[PDB]
Specification:
homodimer; mainly beta; Elongation Factor Tu (Ef-tu), domain 3; 4-stranded antiparallel beta sheet; two-stranded antiparallel ribbon; 1 helix; 9% helix; Protein Bride of doubletime (chain A)
């Protein structure tokens, strides 16, 4: 869950750290040409019958994704979203369509390969 | 504080929204024993006394540095390597080194990058 405000200690050597801030940059996020591994934490909401290789079963659902390879609208939008994550981050995401149907899902970016 | 969890990102033009609800970092995201990092010291340290440090210090801040792990020569620097090895790039943390004397040395670091 929360990282900022966390404490780490090596009591044997008198060392302590308290996180007071987190500032991520484009440098820490997946790029347009990256390959990532991510998780889907539960069934998506309002996916309807929309085709997706990644969204839908048992959870979490693990995946590997090479950016630029997706073939469906939903997957393409999920690439763009994942490109705004940092490895280790879980986020509640949505895609709202031209009709106003919103698809809801929860992802974790595990790593940038 | 500079929080990330709870942060919201939007691409309104294309109907995309994201809300960070958790962060889980692992040893894989932190500097290793053989890494080279770039970090910042945000202000003068407290109670450094006169202990030697290449990195710690009425100069102007922030102070920028590059550190090849395992090259430090002073107790304070060596302990600062160990501490930095518990950061993720982008993290600012209030750190301390407490000696046997019972006294604590305080400083504020930001890990900027793993080279």
């Amino acid at each position: 869950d929360w990282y900022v405000g966390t404490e780490w200690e090596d009591k044997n050597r008198g060392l302590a750290k308290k996180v007071i801030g987190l500032q991520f940059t484009e440098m820490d996020k997946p790029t347009i040409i990256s390959t990532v591994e991510f998780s889907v934490n539960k069934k998506a909401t309002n996916l309807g019958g929309r085709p997706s290789k990644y969204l839908v079963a048992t959870y979490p659902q693990k995946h590997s994704l090479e950016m630029g390879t997706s073939l469906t609208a939903v997957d393409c939008y999920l690439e763009l979203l994942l490109q705004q994550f940092v490895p280790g981050e879980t986020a509640a995401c949505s895609i709202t369509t031209k009709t106003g149907e919103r698809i809801e899902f929860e992802l974790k970016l595990e790593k940038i390969v």
